[PDB]
Design a protein around this ligand. Structure first.
Ligand code: SF4
Lengths: 166, 95, 268, 427, 117, 58, 353, 160
């Protein structure tokens, strides 16, 4: 009960879902400042179903884990993630997050994917905004199911069945 | 005519209301309903006696409102230093 | 009540957990609770080389990156007594001041965003892009830089750097004004800012505030004047100052700084 | 036209008082009241309606009383909260307004108008007086509703909204009752009086002064304009008078006793209504007011807060004059001759006798002896016991006042043929 | 009098709207998968939004509320007057002005007193 | 106020890297700064001081 | 109506039904224009993909809203949760059919409204109380005292402003001697558009309708990029959409009334073009607010409370009173004309220094 | 008429029942509004149209919200022990309810009247002049009552 299981429905609904992406950014790093950049002022995101750019999971289901983080943030983020609605996607934005760039330390959390499952990595710290665009284009066609892995291997149209959803 | 019977019932019900209500605020609510019961009656009779019962009504309303406001004001002033929640939780005047 | 304003909210994006002891309509005191991020750079860098440490320096200042970098650079340079070419030093100030402008752009950008009218941010950002484009040119990096190198920067300027640099200095004065234009009038601006941000100069030092807070309370305290370091000795420019600790004052200071910075560019 | 003055002063002061110091407001307020009061006297025998506002002798008289009582109470105030003057003024106007009408809707509004500020005056934040307040408020609001339905049923029984209506059988018979309850509570007729004892115990003396005067007056004022069943009337009275004095035996609490007494007194006043002799009823209330007014002033001078019986004793030591005054009062309140109380009783009875109502009167008489217990219980207590506990001496204002009052009491005892002449409709 | 038609029409209108309302909610409700609130203790602001050490609130808000009622009554009366306004003459005008003037006095007291902080 | 207090032991890496972080010190002055303030105002009062969390967090 | 059409229960129904869904589609494409007009205003490209011009993006959005969890959280009660948006939308929807759309009997000869009553003003005024009911209720429903407190602010404030709107509507009833829209319109048909007659009442009304929920005092706390409204952020999916929807429906409703009032909707002695003239007035004010909305700030309700209450409402009734004096003695209405015009002129002159 | 008419009065009464049943405050309060909807409707239905609206605006529109705001201000309730849960008093209350209607009922089985003073029904139009003259006193009284009320209310709450 989510818009699937007839030819029609699944493409329909999936187009709906795919094109309405509402980003909730989880700044805690330099990413954010590039993210405000990423919003406006050169390029738009409103043409990708985004007026949502702001802090409520009550407004979004696209999780952008944006920035290098610490131990103290893991349960927090976890919980924030939990307080989203049922279908939800996890972007792991940038190197700082994705595998912990140039820090090997107790303080930090390396490999953000630990805390929550991921579907999209987008390396580079900083990356270019545009890379993120490319990434969400990916994520678009990914949730559309018109994607694979680099071994031709298919995957679910959500991030949210890799570990438990709620 | 029916309505005017109804009006008396609505008053009666209201009395039962007032008497049941353990918390005060809800008492006060019950009363308000009674006040309108009257006014309904009044409206029927206005059709009879020519709409002076309209003007009446208007006045009634205003007074009622007035009497509400101030009473609630009082309720406030009572429980802005209290956690009690019904009238007979204050009792020392009884003898 | 003690209200708990948690991290990442709303778009203020300090890790901020804040225990606001309220009167239920006022703030009494805030016990700020922080430290929910941390790395321990200071530790890590003893486990990397000096060269390597230059990686770390802009990685703790989203704003003026190059300043951290410079400050660290200087320290090293002093230590082994190394000198820097004059041209190098020229470049270094240029980047620095360019980075200051950047910082200010972001400061006011966020200021608007944080609260008050949202929009002008985007214009300030347009300019920021211009700045970024300048950085992109010379360092191949949007921000974070390593162009500065020990003994001076590591390679020559682009020629392309000269046109564009002039260009943006042309546009900016006017632009700056127009941002300023939003603030000083708007009597609502007044009614949101003037009264608040209070703190005596005396207490600013006791609790430790630094320029553009201290100088936001108009107390002259440019470390570039007081402990004048390279080139700035021989550059004219003045101190921009407020005269009281409030938001209101801060905001205007910054605008003036930018103009000073621009003259320094011009000088450079 | 006196009314004119009232409204004006009230309104004007409202804002004025903000700038003025509270002492300047005490000065102001005193003047206003007095000024209105004067003009009232000075307009005696000028019968002037404007609309539902319809001044007669009766109106004049009863509002005379009301202002009087309030003048007294206003005297006493020695706490800096400016409101305890301000509100009183207002309220007074409201009762003036109450009296001079026969148009029901105004009457309704008017009843509420006087009762509202009274609630507020019930609070100097003395915790009991808030408990009191609440109960009272709620009960009041109940009586309102009755009174309102009654009025609706009056419009029901006839298109009239003004008394001097033509009347009918059953429904009107009902209707008059539904008004009489409301009025009853305000006049504290049994069994609608109960709160008045409790509230008095809780409440500060001065407050009570005003209430115990004005409200009763007012209630009766309007009651007179209404025409009521004598059997119903008789019931009410009986219960009122009986329960009152019996419960008055129980006491330890002076004020609460006095409440019970004035229920008996209320019953006694309620006799008059068979005839509706407002010379008589005028007379009565004047007399009652004086004594009670007097009594509470003194009581305040003791303490403005809960008083035991013992506190009363030895009063002649404390001050002789006051002791005598208070004595006279108690006797008048007994209704004893050659005090005016005798006449008040007599008169009531005379109208009763015109109605030929025997049983009622008999009962009345029985309980009128009863009352003397506690009256001597206080009045004599003055003279005995060499002990006393801290008390204060007050202003010369009030002291003199009281002594004036006590002389005026026994004066009208001796010269009732003064007032009766101009209680025809004043003069 | 007035035509009964539009009042009838009112009932109609209300019936339409409410239906479409109800329709919308059941669409929304019936669609979507449902999972437990296994990890739901709060829904906004990790670090836990404050409540339950609050139960008191400024009376400020009360003041406003109370005020408003009184003035709504004010307006009420001025409607008959507005309608029949001309033709009530000066005698009209003076009555109304008085009334108004009373409520303007109301404002001025609580304002100069200003216990609404 | 920016500065680095750097102890090197003469290794290839320093033996101490102290960073003077101004904003961090500036934040100490916050309970002070925000005495007796009004509730919608308090947001701005934080913002006006400029937090870069790197200073703080380190 | 005592001189005006009637139509079948069925035709009534049809018009209603249409008008409801019309306003759905309205809201949709309104968002589009708002987004795009915003972008442009702040010199930016916008929705242009998935269109052309982002046309189909609202569809996507709506579809997004559905197929989701839509749950009540513990510490709330189910019924209240459901009701609380519901109410607001019903009563937001309701009140627009009152207002016309053109000249009488001319919606293909059929009446250009869905209801028309005889009591214009009252209805409007009446509906104005009921939205705020929805609001605070939601607050309470949510069971965070955080949400609640916001809603209390909100409502309080709103309600404050609500009253000034009351004081506004007496004034035109004077002039026409009536309160039904049609006649009011028609009054302007002879004499001319009503803001001429009473510029400060136009003015004060205007700014009071600002004070409606409309994202344009633009703090409340509003929700979207500030401390939030409590009618949101404790909500989910479609229900959330509803709230947002409502705010906009208000916005436009208000934007319609202002034409209704000060102009005729379609009166214009120059030409009669029914529908066109409606939109043009709409459009004007619409943009007008949005331009303010953009370029002007979030306003502490503290300030606001001080502002409206103490200055704005007293001056409005004051203006009324004056007009009432004139009207009571039934003097040349020219005599107001001069003054109205002048007061504006004064208060306009006041701007510059 | 008496089918739907009957219903509406039933509903009205029904609303009454709820408000005297519930001890879920909100639900209670809310019901009373639903009450006022019906009641208003019937006003209009009985040609008291102006009155219909004023009922709506004030009595419902203003008042109950004010009620709720207090119950919010001081938190809701539900707790059914007084010091005396007076459970014995429930039927006895209900007794009194029967009487008080009963007596009116007797009177009204014999009541007879028409309803035929019809003019324009409740419309402020014809009522204004009358109000402005005859009821004028009442008006001015009213105005004073309210103003005094304001003063009272204020004085009640704050220290000062
Ligand atoms: S990847 Fe780079 S830009 Fe992103 S948070 Fe890490 S250091 Fe910052």
């Amino acid at each position: 009960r989510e818009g699937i299981l007839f030819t029609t429905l699944e493409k329909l609904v999936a187009w709906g879902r795919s094109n309405s992406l509402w980003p909730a950014t989880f700044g805690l790093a330099c990413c954010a400042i590039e993210m405000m950049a990423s919003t406006d002022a050169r390029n738009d995101l409103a043409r990708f179903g985004s007026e949502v750019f702001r802090a409520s999971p009550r407004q979004a289901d696209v999780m952008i884990v944006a920035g290098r983080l610490s131990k103290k943030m893991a349960p927090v983020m976890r919980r924030v993630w939990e307080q989203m609605p049922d279908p939800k996607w996890v972007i792991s934005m940038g190197a700082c997050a994705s595998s912990g760039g140039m820090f090997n330390n107790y303080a930090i959390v390396q490999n953000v994917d630990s805390v929550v499952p991921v579907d999209v990595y987008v390396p580079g710290c900083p990356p270019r905004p545009e890379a993120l665009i490319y990434a969400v284009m990916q994520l678009q066609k990914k949730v559309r199911g018109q994607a694979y892995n680099e071994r031709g291997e298919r995957l679910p149209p959500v991030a949210a069945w890799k570990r438990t959803r709620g | 005519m029916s309505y005017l019977l109804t009006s008396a019932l609505l008053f009666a019900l209201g009395v039962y209301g007032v008497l049941t209500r353990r918390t005060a605020i809800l008492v006060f609510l019950s009363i308000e309903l009674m006040l309108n019961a009257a006014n309904l009656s009044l409206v029927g009779f206005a059709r009879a006696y020519g709409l002076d019962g309209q003007v009446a009504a208007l006045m009634v309303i205003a007074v009622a409102a007035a009497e509400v406001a101030v009473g609630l004001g009082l309720i406030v002033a009572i429980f802005r230093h209290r956690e009690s929640t019904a009238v007979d939780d204050l009792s020392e005047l009884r003898g | 009540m003690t209200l708990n304003v948690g991290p990442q909210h709303p778009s203020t994006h300090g890790v901020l957990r804040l225990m606001v002891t309220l009167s239920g309509e006022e703030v009494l005191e805030v016990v700020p609770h922080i430290g929910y991020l941390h790395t321990g750079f200071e530790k890590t860098m003893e486990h990397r080389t000096y060269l390597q440490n230059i990686t770390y320096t802009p990685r703790m200042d989203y704003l003026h990156s190059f300043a951290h970098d410079l400050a660290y650079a200087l320290a090293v340079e002093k230590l082994l007594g190394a000198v820097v070419p004059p041209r190098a030093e020229t470049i270094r100030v240029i980047l620095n001041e360019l980075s200051r402008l950047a910082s200010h752009l972001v400061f006011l950008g966020t200021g608007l965003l944080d609260l008050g009218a949202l929009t002008p941010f985007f214009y300030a950002f347009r300019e920021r892009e211009t700045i970024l484009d300048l950085f992109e040119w010379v360092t191949g990096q949007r921000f974070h830089h390593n162009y500065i190198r020990i003994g001076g920067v590591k390679e020559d300027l682009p020629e392309e750097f000269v046109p564009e640099l002039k260009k943006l200095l042309e546009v900016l004065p006017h632009r700056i004004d127009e941002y300023e234009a939003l603030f000083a009038e708007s009597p609502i601006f007044y009614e949101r800012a003037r009264g608040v941000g209070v703190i005596p100069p005396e207490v600013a030092i006791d609790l430790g505030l630094t320029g553009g807070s201290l100088r936001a309370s108009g107390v002259n305290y440019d470390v570039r004047k007081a402990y004048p370091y390279s080139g700035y000795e021989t550059y004219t420019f003045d101190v921009p100052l407020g005269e009281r600790g409030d938001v209101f004052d801060r905001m205007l200071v910054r605008i003036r700084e930018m103009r000073e910075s621009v003259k320094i560019i011009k000088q450079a | 036209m006196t009314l004119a003055i009232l409204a004006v002063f009230s309104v004007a002061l409202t804002l004025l008082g903000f700038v003025l110091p509270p002492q300047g407001v005490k000065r102001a307020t005193l003047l206003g009241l007095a000024l209105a009061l004067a003009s009232l006297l000075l307009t005696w025998g000028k019968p002037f309606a404007f609309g539902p506002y319809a001044v007669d002798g009766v109106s004049q008289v009863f509002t005379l009383l009301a202002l009087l009582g309030a003048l007294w109470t206003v005297g006493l105030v020695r706490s800096g909260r400016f409101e305890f003057y301000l509100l009183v003024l207002y309220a007074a106007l409201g009762m003036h307004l109450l009296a001079s009408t026969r148009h029901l809707l105004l009457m309704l509004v008017a009843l509420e108008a006087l009762s509202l500020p009274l609630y507020a005056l019930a609070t100097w934040r003395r915790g009991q007086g808030l408990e009191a307040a609440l109960k009272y408020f709620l009960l009041g609001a109940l009586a309102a509703a009755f009174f309102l339905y009654g009025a609706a049923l009056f419009y029901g029984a006839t298109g009239s909204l003004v008394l001097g209506a033509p009347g009918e059988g059953p429904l009107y018979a009902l209707a008059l009752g539904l008004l009489l309850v409301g009025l009853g509570f305000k006049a504290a007729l049994a069994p609608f009086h109960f709160w008045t004892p409790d509230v008095y115990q809780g409440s500060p003396t001065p407050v009570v002064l005003f209430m115990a005067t004005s409200v009763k007056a007012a209630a009766f004022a309007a009651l007179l304009r209404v025409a009521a069943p004598p059997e119903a009337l008789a019931l009410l009275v009986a219960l009122s008078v009986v329960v009152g004095n019996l419960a008055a035996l129980a006491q330890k609490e002076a004020k609460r006793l006095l409440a019970y007494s004035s229920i008996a007194h209320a019953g006694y006043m309620a006799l008059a209504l068979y005839t509706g002799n407002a010379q008589a009823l005028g007379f009565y209330l004047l007399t009652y007011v004086l004594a009670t007014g007097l009594a509470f002033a003194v009581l305040s001078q003791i303490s403005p807060d809960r008083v035991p019986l013992e506190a009363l004793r030895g009063l002649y030591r404390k001050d002789p004059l006051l002791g005598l005054a208070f004595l006279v009062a108690m006797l008048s309140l007994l209704g004893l001759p050659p005090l005016a109380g005798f006449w008040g009783k007599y008169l009531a009875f005379a109208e009763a006798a015109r109605a030929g109502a025997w049983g009622v009167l008999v009962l009345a008489l029985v309980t009128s002896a009863v009352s003397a217990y506690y009256y001597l219980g206080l009045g004599l207590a003055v003279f005995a016991r060499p002990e006393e506990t801290p008390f204060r001496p007050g202003p010369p204002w009030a002291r003199a006042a009281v002594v004036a009052a006590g002389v005026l009491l026994l004066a009208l005892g001796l010269l009732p043929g003064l007032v009766l002449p101009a209680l025809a409709a004043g003069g | 009098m007035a035509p009964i038609q539009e009042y009838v029409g009112t009932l109609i209108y209300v019936g339409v709207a409410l239906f479409i309302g109800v329709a919308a909610l059941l669409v929304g409700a019936l669609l979507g998968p449902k999972k437990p609130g296994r990890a739901k203790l709060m829904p906004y602001e990790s670090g836990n939004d404050p409540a339950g050490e609050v139960k008191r609130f400024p009376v400020h808000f009360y003041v406003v509320a109370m005020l408003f009622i009184l003035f709504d009554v004010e307006v009420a009366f001025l409607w008959p007057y507005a309608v029949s306004a001309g033709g009530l003459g000066l005698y009209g005008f003076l009555g109304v002005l008085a009334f108004t003037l009373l409520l303007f006095v109301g404002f001025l007291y609580e304002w100069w007193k200003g216990v609404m902080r | 106020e920016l500065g680095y207090y750097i102890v090197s032991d003469g290794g290839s890496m320093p033996y101490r890297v102290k960073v003077r972080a101004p904003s961090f010190v500036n934040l100490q002055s916050l309970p002070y700064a925000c005495k007796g303030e009004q509730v919608p105002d308090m947001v701005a009062i934080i913002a006006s001081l400029d937090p870069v969390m790197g200073d703080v967090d380190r | 109506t005592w001189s005006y059409p009637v139509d079948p229960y069925w035709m009534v129904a049809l018009k209603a039904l249409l008008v409801v869904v019309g306003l759905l589609t309205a809201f949709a494409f309104m968002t589009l224009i708002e987004r795009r007009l915003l972008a442009r205003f702040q010199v930016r490209m916008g929705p242009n993909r998935v269109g052309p011009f982002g046309l189909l993006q609202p569809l996507a959005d709506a579809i997004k809203s559905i197929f989701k969890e839509d749950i009540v959280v513990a510490q709330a009660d189910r019924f209240l949760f459901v009701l609380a948006p519901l109410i607001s939308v019903v009563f937001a929807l309701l009140a627009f059919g009152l207002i016309p759309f053109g000249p009488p009997g001319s919606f293909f000869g059929y009446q250009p409204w869905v209801i028309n009553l005889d009591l214009g003003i009252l209805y409007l005024f009446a509906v104005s109380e009921l939205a705020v009911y929805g609001i605070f209720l939601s607050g309470w429903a949510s069971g965070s005292k955080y949400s609640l407190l916001g809603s209390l602010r909100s409502s309080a404030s709103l309600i404050s402003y609500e009253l000034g709107l009351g004081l506004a509507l007496l004034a035109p009833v004077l002039l026409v001697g009536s309160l039904n829209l049609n006649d009011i319109v028609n009054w302007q048909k002879e004499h001319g558009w009503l803001f001429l007659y009473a510029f400060p009442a136009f003015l004060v009304y205007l700014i009071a309708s600002m004070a409606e929920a409309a994202r344009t005092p633009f703090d409340l706390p509003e929700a979207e990029q500030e401390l939030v409204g409590g009618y949101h952020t404790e909500y989910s999916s479609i229900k959330w959409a509803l709230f947002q929807m409502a705010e906009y429906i208000h916005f436009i409703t208000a934007s319609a009334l202002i034409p209704t009032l000060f102009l005729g909707g379609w009166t214009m002695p120059v030409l009669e073009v029914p529908y066109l003239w409606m939109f043009l007035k709409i459009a004007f004010f619409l943009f007008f607010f949005i331009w303010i909305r953009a370029t002007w700030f979030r306003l502490r309700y503290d300030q606001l409370l001080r502002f409206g209450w103490g200055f704005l409402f007293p001056l409005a009734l004051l203006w009324f009173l004056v007009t009432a004096l004139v009207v009571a003695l039934d003097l040349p209405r020219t005599y107001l004309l001069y003054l109205s015009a002048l007061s504006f002129l004064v208060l306009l002159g006041a701007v510059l220094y | 008429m008496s089918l739907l008419e009957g219903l509406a009065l039933f509903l009205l009464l029904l609303s009454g029942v709820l408000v005297v049943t519930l001890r879920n405050a909100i639900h209670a309060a809310l019901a009373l509004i639903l009450n006022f909807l019906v009641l208003a409707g019937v006003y209009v239905a009985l040609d008291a149209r102006f009155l219909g609206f004023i009922q709506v605006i004030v009595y419902a529109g203003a008042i109950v919200v004010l009620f709720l705001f207090v119950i919010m201000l001081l938190f809701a309730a539900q707790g059914e022990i007084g010091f005396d849960p007076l459970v014995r008093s429930r039927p006895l209350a209900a007794l009194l309810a029967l009487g008080v209607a009963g007596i009116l009922a007797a009177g009204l089985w014999g009541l007879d009247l028409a309803f035929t003073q019809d003019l324009k029904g409740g419309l402020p139009q014809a009522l204004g002049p009358l109000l402005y003259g005859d009821w004028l006193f009442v008006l001015l009284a009213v105005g004073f009552l309210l103003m005094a009320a304001t003063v009272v209310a204020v004085a009640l709450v704050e220290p000062g």
